[PDB]
Design an enzyme around this catalytic site. Structure first.
Site, PDB file in Angstrom:
ATOM      1  N   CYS A  16      -4.112   3.008  33.089  1.00 24.16           N
ATOM      2  CA  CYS A  16      -4.378   1.619  33.526  1.00 24.16           C
ATOM      3  C   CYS A  16      -5.392   1.793  34.842  1.00 24.16           C
ATOM      4  O   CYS A  16      -6.504   2.525  34.730  1.00 24.16           O
ATOM      5  CB  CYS A  16      -3.451   0.462  34.018  1.00 24.16           C
ATOM      6  SG  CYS A  16      -4.179  -0.982  33.841  1.00 24.16           S
ATOM      7  N   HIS A  73      -8.249   1.667  32.312  1.00 28.46           N
ATOM      8  CA  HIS A  73      -8.181   0.279  31.776  1.00 28.46           C
ATOM      9  C   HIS A  73      -9.654  -0.043  31.747  1.00 28.46           C
ATOM     10  O   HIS A  73     -10.546   0.486  32.379  1.00 28.46           O
ATOM     11  CB  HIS A  73      -7.563  -0.683  32.647  1.00 28.46           C
ATOM     12  CG  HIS A  73      -7.581  -2.174  31.887  1.00 28.46           C
ATOM     13  ND1 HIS A  73      -8.651  -3.017  32.033  1.00 28.46           N
ATOM     14  CD2 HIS A  73      -6.527  -2.833  31.318  1.00 28.46           C
ATOM     15  CE1 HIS A  73      -8.307  -3.969  31.456  1.00 28.46           C
ATOM     16  NE2 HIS A  73      -7.166  -3.838  30.898  1.00 28.46           N
TER      17      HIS A  73
END
Lengths: 188, 188
Positions: A106, A126
């Site tokens: 992420c 992400h």
């Protein structure tokens, strides 16, 4: 063989799903996992307020190295804390020097940027963390759900956590173990 | 509309991923979630040793009802503890009487059997918990990753947790919100 070891660095604001899935899946893999609290041994309040009690403080866990993999969960605030930690900088540099695996998911990979880790590697993050990660063009971006360029393993988000975790398992214990661990999870 | 409320019952041995994913996703959905510790307010040691600190004891949370959904995470030992709890039996019966949603995942649904909840419903469980759930033929079994028969919502395992959580979100806040919450998770 001896059991592989994993260090999961837990900071306030960490994405709890990206922390628990890797820890759980790795332990299912027979890996000895240490959840180390960046700020100490006290409970950590994650991004969605789930409170997790670390196994030990990073300060102490740091003295029990070396680990076959250092895991950096995501969550914007959690990743920023990781990025600002001198202790994390040192741990990552030593791991990189040892030719050890470093896994980040992420917003987690932006901590690698902050500590100048693995420059030149193909990485993913992400979608919302791409610009931050690509500042300076020190890495080559990828949209693969899980990206592994040598000893730098990255993933995109909560929804890629299982794939991320199983990729770590495969790298440490092999494809057979990864497959065995995967089946009982009831993944699509 | 006021915010919907969710009660997640956390017992020792609960599957941490099946606890955190629903809590996290529901909070992303604007749902007010209460992580209630079955045995009290002390930290709970989950199936793979992740230690979570509940928001409150079930004893206390029970007095702050009603909840739009009561969530039962899985994990064989966690499910067993929920199945043996008189407090859980009362909570579930009230919820069923109130025509309130009850969601259980993995081995979690076997607690519905223990408390004679939702008999006659079509349900699913982790493959390894099927026999236990089907003892007596009180339910009709399903292999769907997520099964929803009226107010009884069930799912199969860690790998179906996101689908399970998003189904709860859809039932409480609608399809639009579920879709909005889903996008940033980077699910396949």
């Amino acid at each position: 063989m001896a059991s592989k070891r994993a260090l999961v660095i837990l900071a306030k604001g960490a994405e709890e799903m990206e922390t628990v899935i890797p820890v759980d899946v790795m332990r299912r893999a027979g890996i000895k996992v240490t959840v180390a609290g960046l700020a100490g041994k006290d409970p950590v309040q994650c991004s969605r307020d789930v409170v997790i009690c670390p196994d030990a403080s990073l300060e102490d866990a740091k003295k029990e190295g070396p680990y076959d993999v250092v895991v950096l969960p995501g969550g914007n605030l959690g990743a920023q804390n990781l990025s600002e930690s001198a202790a994390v900088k040192e741990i990552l540099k030593e791991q990189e020097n040892r030719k050890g695996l470093i896994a980040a998911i992420c917003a987690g990979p932006t901590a690698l940027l902050a500590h100048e880790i693995g420059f030149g590697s193909k990485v993913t993050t992400h979608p919302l963390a791409k610009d931050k990660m690509m500042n300076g063009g020190h890495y080559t971006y990828s949209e693969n759900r899980v990206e592994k360029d040598g000893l730098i393993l990255t993933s995109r988000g909560p929804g890629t956590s299982f794939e991320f975790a199983l990729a770590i398992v495969e790298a440490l214990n092999g494809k057979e173990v990864a497959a065995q661990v995967k089946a009982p999870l009831v993944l699509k």
